[model samples]
Target: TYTVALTGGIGSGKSTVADEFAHLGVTVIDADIIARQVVEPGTPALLAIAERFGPQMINDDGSLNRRRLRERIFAHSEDKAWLNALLHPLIQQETRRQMQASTSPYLLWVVPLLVENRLTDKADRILVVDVPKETQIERTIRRDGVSREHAEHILAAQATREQRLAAADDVIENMGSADAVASHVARLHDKYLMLASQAAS
Candidate 1:
């Protein structure tokens, strides 16, 4: 099956474009969402998180307490690294399982830290959702409910501008509105579908 990795730093519109692909009936699996599932309630990974960071990250209702955990990790780098260590392997396993089960034209793996984790290379093509650094901070603050400083901190952790561009086989400049973003994705969908269809035959 055809597989593609849709990646970008925080708030670069990777998920938005992945949603558009879902609307077109293409299978899209978000790594972030998959990561959350790995640690839900009684999962082994969830137990590991609580053991490493204490039980404060869970709610009284037996749900993950996102804000508390976010604050905990954001203030401590080692905590974040430790959490990823417990979570990434479980997430990667599930992601690989899902990708194998899919028979769609291609699978869009929406991962924010694809490069950082180095889990999988995915397809022949790599698409980076592009945007300016200033715009990244602005949108991230709005979407993630964080201050500019926090957003900038997250941005700095991702692959740099030159590094991201050098790794990209294809890119969509998402600095503008939704309509502009759609135009580029639509064209790519058609082009890639034709190419994949031919390759399969």
Candidate 2:
């Protein structure tokens, strides 16, 4: 499949950019969604997590206790590695399945940690949704209702803006109006369709 991996830091309007591509009929596979799906309730991934991290990692409703799990992983590098090792392959398998089932000319993979997770090579093209650091911080604070320090801390854990830019085959500077964002997506849509057809040939 012709895959375009779309990535950005927190509050970089990745979802907005991905929405435009979806509106234009692209098959958008969000890695975050797949991440959650893999651990949903009774899945093997969830079972493994419960087994390793204890049953307390599961909620009364059978969902994963994501906040508790995050705190554990963030505080311990060994735990983080263990969780990643368990989830990454499951996520990759499901992502591949979704890609294989896609009917669009190209598949858009909305992977928030594309650069951090070293998954850039999985894509035929990398499209980055970028914004200034301050914009990212402000938007994240506004959207997530977190303190400035909290937002900055989350940003600190991800790939740097320079690293993301350097990895991009295409970039959308998402600092403008929705119309502006849509125009960028429209142009990329045409470009990707052309590239997808070319690849098919």
Candidate 3:
């Protein structure tokens, strides 16, 4: 299938834009959700995590203790590397499976770390949800209830606005009203449908 990877910074409203596409009956496969699914309780990935990080990594209910595991990996570079090595392939495999099964005219792959993870080539086209850095920080702080400094730090950790825009085959300036966002998504939906049909022929 022709895949359009949609990416944006923390507070750039990627989900809102994707939701617009979903409303149009597009298949939206989100990488963040797949990341969690691959490590769900009773999955091989979760079992491996439990073995590598000890039973503390698994909650009493058999789910992964995400917060503790996050802290552990954050403090240990090797452990983080190990975890990524184990999960990245699994995530990619699942992503491919979902994409192949999608019956939409084109697949909308929502990947927040597309640029950071060097996975831009995985998509047939790139759509970036963009906002200014100040806007990102303000929105993230308000949405996530984090301090300005913390929000800024998180933004700094991701690909910059310029980098994302540079890679964008299409861009949605999300600093507008909901109707504006829906309009942009609607326009792109038509474009992607045409593109997908062209690719098929």
Give each model's whole-structure lDDT: 0.80, 0.91, 0.90
Model 1 residue 44 lDDT?
80
- Per-residue accuracy of model 1 over 73-184 as CA lDDT, tens digit each: 8899678888877878888898888878777797777767777777446565678888899989998888778999998788778888777777787888885677877888
Candidate 3: minimum summed lDDT over ten consecutive residues — where? 175-184
Off by over 4 Å in 3: 60-62, 113-122, 143-145, 157-159
What candidate 1 gets wrong by more than 4 Å, as runs, is 41-57, 60-62, 69-89, 114-122
Stretches of candidate 2 exceeding 4 Å from the true structure? 51-55, 74-82, 111-122, 144-146, 153-163
Candidate 3 local lDDT, 1-201, one digit each (tens)? 888999999999899889999999999998788999999989999999888889999989999998889899788978978888999999999988987778888889888899999998989999999988998988888887999999988988998899999999999999767897899889999999999999999
Backbone clashes for every candidate come to: 0, 0, 0
**TM-score quality measure for candidate 2:** 0.75
Q: Candidate 2 on 13-32: residue-level lDDT in tens? A: 89889989999989999978
Query: For model 1, where is the 10-residue window of minimal lDDT?
Result: 116-125
Error of 3 at 44 (Å): 3.4
Instruction: Give candidate 1's TM-score.
Output: 0.74
Any idea what lDDT model 1 has?
Answer: 0.80
Taking all chains together, each candidate's TM-score versus the true structure is 0.74, 0.75, 0.79
Q: Identify the superior model by lDDT, candidate 1 or candidate 2.
A: 2
lDDT of 3: 0.90
